[PDB]
Amino acid sequence: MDWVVAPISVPENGKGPFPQRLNQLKSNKDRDTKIFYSITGPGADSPPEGVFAVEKETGWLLLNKPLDREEIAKYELFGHAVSENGASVEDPMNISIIVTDQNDHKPKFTQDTFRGSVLEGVLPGTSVMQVTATDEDDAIYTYNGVVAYSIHSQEPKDPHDLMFTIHRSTGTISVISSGLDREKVPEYTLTIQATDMDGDGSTTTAVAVVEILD
Amino acid sequence: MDWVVAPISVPENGKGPFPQRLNQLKSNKDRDTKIFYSITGPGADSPPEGVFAVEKETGWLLLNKPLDREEIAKYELFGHAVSENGASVEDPMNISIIVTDQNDHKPKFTQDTFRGSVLEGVLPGTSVMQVTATDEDDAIYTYNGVVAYSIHSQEPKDPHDLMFTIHRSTGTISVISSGLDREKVPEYTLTIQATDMDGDGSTTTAVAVVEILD
Ligand SMILES: Cc1[nH]c2ccc(Cl)cc2c1CCN
Ligand SMILES: Cc1[nH]c2ccc(Cl)cc2c1CCN
Ligand SMILES: Cc1[nH]c2ccc(Cl)cc2c1CCN
Ligand SMILES: [Ca+2]
Ligand SMILES: [Ca+2]
Ligand SMILES: [Ca+2]
Ligand SMILES: [Ca+2]
Ligand SMILES: [Ca+2]
Ligand SMILES: [Ca+2]
């Protein structure tokens, strides 16, 4: 029994001493003459050259430097089996390296200051504006690139402490409180925050400035 | 040509819906009769049960729920292939699952307050105490569990502002400037910090209280 495909999943930004062994190539034809293992492909001989390499006599595939998924997320290499005569013995094996994602990028708002406005008399619940942060890490298979929005603070605290809220996933800011009035407070400064790992990771900060209209 | 062993490396705390395909089993004798696949082992048919499954007809190994490395870091399963007639066609194949680490643990100081003392006349460079934070994530293959130490602030600022240093990786607090004096300042309060991903991650905060002795 075997796998139809056996890719190698390697987490990026690996820590330990390099090189590192991943898996070990074997030719079943090795019960005859001593065979020599090599490797080809981008990441091996095509650029980026030398990221992976194979020990000639042992077949151990080696990773030489830490990977960065956001630079290259998958490799397609080829293992080669030859004899002393430098003659290959069986077709080259496909090698698929999948770089799995770590949380090595912090979220980043698209702007330092977002600007919106709303009419003083809108109903609680009315949307005002939408803010956006991005995260270089994966958000499809992991949480590393999943941003959660929040409002840090509101200035001025007049009338209520908290006039606005934000949708934690979409970044839409809405009115949650009655009492907006341009003549009393014409503008609010909301310190907004975006945290990766869906709220458990790192945070950056920005500002949403909301103008209150008559 | 093939891999000597082919472990499946699965990042913990995965997102998206479940179940998810990992690798697909295949029996060599696949034209002899219809093959029905199954898996056994802890994580499959013994506790924790049902973490893994195989599609009886297709051989797809499935992950049924998110893994937590800090709960179980490796699994050893077995794949079985039996014909429609009820014959086991090959030896059960060993299935090795490696749970790779994500950064799902902030570092935690061993105590909320660390207390140490030093004599007033020590030479700069003299060690005062060692504070400690732990991080449940892996620190051998990743940086997710590697803690970096820092001193946030010192009170009272009294003689200098930088009376002490903390060793970024050992957590040893040293005195760095001569000029201590129990009579002028008998007790400093250091606000200490510990940050995972070797300083690029999340930070906890604790306190160190250094008493100055006669
Ligand atoms: C970071 C990352 N990138 C992928 C791309 C393809 C596949 Cl199979 C898995 C992954 C993962 C980890 C899944 N939690
Ligand atoms: C846990 C954690 N993670 C962060 C990510 C970014 C920033 Cl600025 C701060 C933090 C903190 C708390 C700092 N006391
Ligand atoms: C990231 C990671 N985590 C591990 C845990 C156990 C073992 Cl065997 C290997 C690993 C690796 C891959 C090293 N290229
Ligand atoms: Ca790279
Ligand atoms: Ca991130
Ligand atoms: Ca990443
Ligand atoms: Ca589990
Ligand atoms: Ca951690
Ligand atoms: Ca972890």
Structural contact between residues A101 and A9, judged by C-beta atoms closer than 8 angstroms:
no
Residues of A with CB under 8 A from a CB of B: 1-11, 13-16, 23-28, 59, 79, 81, 90-93, 100-104, 139-144, 146, 197, 200-202
Resolution in A: 2.5
Element counts in chain A: helices (H) and strands (E): 0, 17
User: Is there a cis peptide before residue B19, judged by omega within 30 degrees of 0?
Assistant: yes
Integer Cα distance of A177 and B165 in angstroms: 48
Structural contact between residues A83 and A76, judged by C-beta atoms closer than 8 angstroms:
no
Structural contact between residues A58 and A37, judged by C-beta atoms closer than 8 angstroms:
yes
CB-based contacts of B202-207 (< 8 A; 24+ apart in sequence): B202/A201, B202/A202, B202/B103, B202/B106, B202/B107, B203/B106, B203/B107, B204/B106, B204/B107, B204/B108, B204/B109, B204/B133, B205/B109, B205/B152, B206/B109, B206/B111, B206/B112, B206/B113, B206/B114, B206/B131, B206/B133, B207/B112, B207/B113, B207/B114
Strands (DSSP E) found in chain B: 2-3, 8-11, 20-26, 35-40, 52-54, 60-63, 74-83, 93-100, 108-109, 113-119, 127-130, 133-134, 148-155, 164-166, 172-175, 187-195, 203-213
Structural contact between residues A188 and A209, judged by C-beta atoms closer than 8 angstroms:
yes
Supply the DSSP symbol for A44: T
Structural contact between residues A190 and A151, judged by C-beta atoms closer than 8 angstroms:
yes
Of B135, B113, B139, the C-alpha closest to B194 is B135
Integer Cα distance of A115 and A129 in angstroms: 8
Sheet containing strand B127-130, edge to edge, reads B127-130, B172-175, B164-166
Sheet containing strand A2-3, edge to edge, reads A2-3, B20-26, B60-63, B52-54
Which tokens in the block code for residue B12? 């913990």
Of B2, B76, B1, the C-alpha closest to B41 is B76
Integer Cα distance of B49 and B59 in angstroms: 19
Of A133, A140, A71, A69, the C-alpha closest to A107 is A133
Could you tell me the residue ranges of all domains in chain B? Answer: 4-102, 103-214
Nearest-CB residue to B23 (from A5, A13, A144): A5
**Residue that is written with structure tokens 């003299």 in the block:** B126
Print burial letters for B116-152: b (CB count within 10 Å at least 16), e (below 16).
Answer: eebebebeeeeebbebbbebebbbeebbbbbbbbebe
Structural contact between residues B39 and B53, judged by C-beta atoms closer than 8 angstroms:
yes
Which tokens in the block code for residue A21? 């062994």
**Residue that is written with structure tokens 């004899």 in the block:** A83
Structural contact between residues A144 and B15, judged by C-beta atoms closer than 8 angstroms:
no
Structural contact between residues A213 and A117, judged by C-beta atoms closer than 8 angstroms:
yes
Nearest-CB residue to B100 (from A23, A24, A100): A100
Closest-CA residue in chain A for B90? A1
Structural contact between residues B8 and B93, judged by C-beta atoms closer than 8 angstroms:
no
Structural contact between residues A53 and A77, judged by C-beta atoms closer than 8 angstroms:
no
Handedness of CA B134, B99, A12, A69 (dihedral sign): negative
Of A134, A152, A154, the C-alpha closest to A144 is A134
List, in sequence order, every residue forming a beta bridge with A53; answer none if it has no partner: A62
Residues of B with CB under 8 A from a CB of A: 1-11, 13-16, 23-28, 59, 79, 81, 90-93, 100-104, 139-144, 146, 197, 200-202
Q: Whose CA is nearest to atom 11 of ligand 3?
A: B141
Closest-CA residue in chain A for B142? A15
Pocket test for ligand 1, best of A74, A96, A138 (most atoms within 8 A of CB): A138
Name the burial class of residue A75, with classes exposed (0-12), middle (13-18) and buried (19+) by CB atoms within 10 angstroms of its CB: buried
Pocket test for ligand 1, best of A142, A197, A198 (most atoms within 8 A of CB): A142
Supply the DSSP symbol for B97: E
Of B80, B41, B75, B29, the C-alpha closest to B59 is B80
What backbone torsions phi and psi does residue B87 show, to the nearest 5 degrees? -95, 135
Who's near A71: CB < 8 A, 6+ residues apart? none
Print burial letters for A123-135: b (CB count within 10 Å at least 16), e (below 16).
Answer: eeeeebbebebeb
Of A163, A162, A154, A166, the C-alpha closest to A130 is A166
Which tokens in the block code for residue A195? 């945290």
Residue type for position A17: P
Cα–Cα distances in Å, from A207 out to A132, A179, B175? 11, 22, 41
Which tokens in the block code for residue B104? 């799902």
Name the burial class of residue A57, with classes exposed (0-12), middle (13-18) and buried (19+) by CB atoms within 10 angstroms of its CB: exposed
Who's near A85: CB < 8 A, 6+ residues apart? none
Integer Cα distance of A193 and A108 in angstroms: 10
Of B131, B118, B129, the C-alpha closest to B187 is B118
Parallel, antiparallel or unpaired: strands B35-40 and B52-54: unpaired
Supply the DSSP symbol for B143: S
Parallel, antiparallel or unpaired: strands A8-11 and A88-100: parallel
Strands (DSSP E) found in B67-140: 74-83, 93-100, 108-109, 113-119, 127-130, 133-134
Structural contact between residues B145 and B101, judged by C-beta atoms closer than 8 angstroms:
yes
Q: Is A199 helix (H, G, I), strand (E, B) or coil?
A: helix
Q: Is A82 helix (H, G, I), strand (E, B) or coil?
A: strand
Which tokens in the block code for residue A178? 């009655």
